[PDB]
Amino acid sequence: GELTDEDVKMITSLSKDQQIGEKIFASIAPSIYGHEDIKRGLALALFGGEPKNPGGKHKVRGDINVLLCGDPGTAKSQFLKYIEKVSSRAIFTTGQGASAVGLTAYVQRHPVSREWTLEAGALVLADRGVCLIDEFDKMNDQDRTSIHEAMEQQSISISKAGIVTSLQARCTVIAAANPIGGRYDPSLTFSENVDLTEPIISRFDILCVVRDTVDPVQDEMLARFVVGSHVRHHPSNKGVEPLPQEVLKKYIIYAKERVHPKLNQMDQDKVAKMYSDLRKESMATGSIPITVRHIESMIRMAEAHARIHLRDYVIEDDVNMAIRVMLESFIDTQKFSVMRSMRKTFARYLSFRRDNNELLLFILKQLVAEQVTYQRNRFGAQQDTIEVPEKDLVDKARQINIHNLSAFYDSELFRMNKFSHDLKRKMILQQF
């Protein structure tokens, strides 16, 4: 499946792109619309960080474990399926009983080969690969104990028949969970609307809170996406980003260029100050406190980002992007009040490589949704030609120091979201 011979020069060639990171983020799960942040986190997980063991007595993993917790029908199962396709040594398992391979090791006579075999579980069969666990919230007690041991010590301890062994499982765990009650509640913390204990949640570098909300524009976009899929795969006749997608073949080969390890000798005062500020905020506000493991996961994600660019040294942009990812994961997992406060105070960290067009689009969506809720609360339904003044958008763009909205109005992204600029009355409005 992999040879990587003479194929390395073109790998380095597109590594020279200086926008290869966005190309790779754009080239995963091409069949899933949107979810750009989950795609970036899954790309980091695929490349992973640097395992280290100072001496032989302090073991830190390089694996980046991703937990997708989101209300139903949001392509989490599809994400896991894609990761299984794109990677070598990926085995897919489910928290229910609906899979070939279970999480726990056992020894038994094999049903078809009749051979007494040690059925080392899903965690160790993916020893240097990926363990994809769907329905993560629906595990047994013993599956939870197996996953805790594998995520904690990176080995599985059998003491079952006469076998006493510790056979090891150094996998990246990508899990998908449904929230308690079938819908994520932003007024609760991540830990208290998912049926997982803190020891398990703490073992995940990225916690992606997938969130099914009714946005008419994205609803139209997704509906077009999926209906187009249904049209083009009709048995008779047998994609929106700034960057070109990269074909999954050279992409598998590119990711398989993990033969080169990687190393970092870069800034420490910025990172240390950032953690100190995070501590002061997260212990001022009554929130989930940042800890050491958060900076260690940030280091993993920086190493992964450097590996995506084949750098062999973390560069300040790798660190900055890892900070943005670690903070996005840490901030979305707070309750709503704390999430707003941290979005505000850490916004300079949080908007790295987040250009003006998308920030402004987010603000505009926020105001238009505010307006639509206001309308439909005492008008029975949302109206047609939903609009908003120029001024308040200008005001909020100043609040984040934009002051130049002209390119936002000329933007492809502005037009793509069914927006329009009406300079006659300083109005901007949506069609639906």
Ligand X SMILES: Nc1ncnc2c1ncn2[C@@H]1O[C@H](COP(=O)(O)OP(=O)(O)OP(=O)(O)O)[C@@H](O)[C@H]1O
Site membership for Mg ion, residue 291 (CB under 5 A): no
d(CA 147, CA 152): 8
Query: 108, 117 in Cβ contact below 8 A?
Result: yes
Rounded to whole angstroms, the Cα distance separating 278 from 248 reads 38
Query: Applying CB under 6 A, which part among 70-78, 279-287, 310-318, 399-407 lies near ligand X?
Result: 70-78
Q: Is 27 annotated as a binding residue?
A: no
How far apart, in whole angstroms, are the C-alpha atoms of residue 103 and residue 94?
8
33 is an interface residue for ligand X by CB under 6 A:
yes
Report if residue 106 touches ligand X, rule: CB under 6 A: no
Report in angstroms how near the CB of residue 212 gets to another protein at its nearest.
6
Min CB(182)–Mg ion separation in Å = 12
Stretch that binds ligand X, among 28-36, 242-250, 345-353, 398-406 (CB under 6 A): 28-36
DSSP secondary structure code for residue 319 in this structure: H
Return the residue matching tokens 């639906």.
432
Q: How many residues in the shown chain lie near Mg ion by CB under 5 A?
A: 1
The breaks in the chain (C to N more than 2.5 Å) occur after: 238
Backbone angles phi, psi at 391, to 5 degrees: -65, -50
The residue among 78 and 245 lying less far from Mg ion, judged by its C-beta, is 78
* Contact pick of 4, 72, 89, 117 for ligand X (by CB under 6 A): 72
Q: 2 contacts which partner out of Mg ion, ligand X, another protein, none, CB within 5 to 8 A by kind?
A: none
Q: Which residues bind another protein (CB under 8 A)?
A: 72-74, 186-187, 212, 222-223, 226-227, 230, 283-286, 335-337, 370, 373-374, 377-378
**39, 76, 294, 309: which one binds ligand X (CB under 6 A):** 76
| Annotated binding-site residue? 78 | yes
Q: Which does 240 bind (CB under 5 to 8 A by kind): ligand X, another protein, Mg ion, none?
A: none
State which residue, 60 or 222, has the beta carbon closest to Mg ion. Answer: 222
DSSP letters, 140-196, are -HHHHHHHHHHHHHSEEEEESSS-EEEEE--PEEEEEEPPGGGS--TTS-GGGSSS-
Of the candidates 27, 65, 74, 154, which one interacts with ligand X according to CB under 6 A?
74
Residue 373 binding partner per list ligand X, Mg ion, another protein, none, with a CB distance cut-off of 5 to 8 Å that depends on partner kind? another protein
Question: Cα–Cα distance between 166 and 269 in angstroms, integer?
Answer: 40
Rounded Cα distance between 393 and 3, Å, is 53
Closest CA to 193 of 215, 174, 211, 213: 211
Binding positions for ligand X, 213-232, rule CB under 6 A: 222, 226
Sheet with 427-430: list strands edge to edge: 386-389, 427-430, 419-422
Number of residues that bind ligand X (CB under 6 A): 14
Phi/psi at 153 (5° precision): -105, -10
Q: Kindly state whether residue 77 participates in binding ligand X, applying the rule CB under 6 A.
A: yes
Secondary-structure percent of the chain, ordered helix, strand, coil, rounded to 5: 45, 15, 40
List b or e across 335-345, with b for residues whose CB sees 16 or more CB atoms inside 10 angstroms. Answer: beebbebbeeb
Return the residue of 15, 17, 60, 77 that touches Mg ion, per CB under 5 A: 77
Q: Are 30 and 279 in contact (CB under 8 A)?
A: no
Stretch that binds Mg ion, among 71-79, 154-162, 278-286, 297-305 (CB under 5 A): 71-79
Nearer to another protein, 230 or 232 (CB): 230
Q: Which two tokens stand for residue 352?
A: 């790295």
- Report residue 118: phi and psi, to 5°: -85, 105
Q: Using CB distances below 5 to 8 A depending on partner kind, what does residue 247 bind out of another protein, Mg ion, ligand X, none?
A: none
Annotate each residue in 178-207 with x if it binds ligand X (CB under 6 A) or - if it does not, as one string. Answer: x-----------------------------
Which entry of another protein, Mg ion, ligand X, none binds 199, CB below 5 to 8 A by partner kind?
A: none
Q: Which does 309 bind (CB under 5 to 8 A by kind): ligand X, another protein, Mg ion, none?
A: none
Q: Are 384 and 430 in contact (CB under 8 A)?
A: no
Q: Give me the least distance between CB of 339 and another protein, in Å please.
A: 10
Q: Which CB, 77 or 341, lies closer to Mg ion?
A: 77
- Min dist. Cβ of residue 56 to ligand X (A): 41
CB 211 within 8 A of CB 226: no
Which residues fall in the annotated binding site for ADP? 77-78
Residues that bind ligand X (CB under 6 A): 32-35, 72-78, 178, 222, 226
- Which residues are at the interface with Mg ion (CB under 5 A)? 77
